[PDB]
Design a protein around this ligand. Structure first.
Ligand SMILES: CCCCCCCCCCCCCCCCCC(=O)OC[C@H](COP(=O)(O)OCCN)OC(=O)CCCCCCCCCCCCCCCCC
Ligand SMILES: CCCCCCCCCCCC(=O)OC[C@H](COP(=O)(O)OCC[N+](C)(C)C)OC(=O)CCCCCCCCCCC
Ligand SMILES: CCCCCCCCCCCC(=O)OC[C@H](COP(=O)(O)OCC[N+](C)(C)C)OC(=O)CCCCCCCCCCC
Ligand SMILES: CCCCCCCCCCCC(=O)OC[C@H](COP(=O)(O)OCC[N+](C)(C)C)OC(=O)CCCCCCCCCCC
Lengths: 171, 61
């Protein structure tokens, strides 16, 4: 909660989780893949994440040890989402998060690869990207045409792929 | 006799300019103020539109 300052020393511990806790696959995705697939892991794994945080609320200060069984399932279902999005559109997912590698991981600077990825995942993985808390007669911001805030440099691969998807008629 | 001196022309010189040449230049001051308020208000339009757009971007992130 507070930052380490004044000569902090990093240390690691070679040790293992005990016998009674089963093993769990951990997420190997990085900040641009994770920020890319954030909306789709939030769309598929809403009740599991909600179960985890609601358990952690109900057992106060228990915290760590007593809702471990449910933090298993949130990691498992998000790994399921990212495996499925790899096998579905590895190329356009890659186009998206390689765009997000530049521009400070700003989501504002990568709209034209984001449209391709959202179409490809809604077509095949059939998850939709939505923003809740947004009452009607308020346009969602990744749908609007001529935004005020445009990126400095459109990346070249996604402009070319966006024009090719115009020409194919899939868009 | 007086030969070889410099003398004025027989017709005289043309008249020089010795009045003040300070013509009032510029638009009316109400034109500059109306232009000022227009330039400002269009700037406030674009600025507050960009602030609201940045707020929606912060919501998304
Ligand atoms: C604070 C400083 C802000 C920066 C400086 C702002 C300069 C003021 C910009 C005003 C724009 C302008 O050029 O004025 C319009 C000008 C005459 O304006 P006016 O005679 O008052 O009538 C306007 C009726 N539409 O209209 C014209 O002169 C048009 C001339 C057309 C013929 C040209 C020959
Ligand atoms: C490189 C871009 C520089 C832009 C200039 C800086 C911002 C503008 C400042 C406003 C001053 C102004 O331009 O006012 C325009 C006036 C001329 O109007 P007037 O003859 O008095 O008739 C007004 C009669 N009324 C009142 C009935 C309508 O003054 C001048 O032109 C004087 C020379 C300043 C030149 C500045 C360069 C711009 C070219 C203008 C050629 C006409
Ligand atoms: C680097 C680019 C060049 C910039 C150099 C600056 C240009 C100066 C031109 C002379 C203008 C002038 O003197 O206008 C003079 C006028 C006053 O006119 P008046 O005496 O009341 O006319 C009365 C008689 N009439 C109406 C019949 C003609 O001022 C004003 O009301 C407001 C002054 C605002 C000047 C803002 C200029 C912005 C420049 C900054 C960029
Ligand atoms: C004393 C101050 C009095 C101001 C009176 C001006 C009323 C003019 C009506 C135009 C409103 C409009 O139509 O522009 C609306 C704009 C743009 O918003 P948008 O993104 O397009 O809306 C989309 C709605 N969403 C976001 C929900 C989707 O927003 C503004 O804020 C600009 C207002 C004009 C600037 C006024 C500044 C006045 C100068 C103040 C000097 C300190």
């Amino acid at each position: 909660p507070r930052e380490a300052a004044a000569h902090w020393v990093p240390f690691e511990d070679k040790a293992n989780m005990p016998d009674n806790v089963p093993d769990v696959v951990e997420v190997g995705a990085t900040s641009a893949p994770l920020l890319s697939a954030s909306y789709f892991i939030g769309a598929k794994c809403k009740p599991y994440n909600d179960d985890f945080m609601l358990c952690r609320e109900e057992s106060q200060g228990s915290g760590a040890i007593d809702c471990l069984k449910e933090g298993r399932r949130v990691t498992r279902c998000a790994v399921s989402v990212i495996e499925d999005i790899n096998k579905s559109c590895l190329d356009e997912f890659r186009l998206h998060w390689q765009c997000l590698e530049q521009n400070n991981h700003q989501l504002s600077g990568c709209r034209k690869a984001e449209a391709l990825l959202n179409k490809c995942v809604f077509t095949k993985l059939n998850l939709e990207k939505k923003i809740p808390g947004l009452r009607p007669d308020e346009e969602p911001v990744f749908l609007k045409k001529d935004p005020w805030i445009k990126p400095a440099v459109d990346d070249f691969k996604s402009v070319r792929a966006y024009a090719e998807a115009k020409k194919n008629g899939t868009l | 006799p007086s030969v070889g001196q410099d003398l004025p022309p027989v017709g005289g010189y043309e008249p020089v300019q010795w009045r003040r040449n300070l013509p009032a230049r510029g638009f009316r001051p109400l034109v500059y103020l109306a232009a000022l308020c227009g330039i400002c208000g269009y700037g406030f339009y674009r600025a507050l539109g960009g602030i609201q757009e940045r707020r929606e971007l912060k919501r998304e992130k």
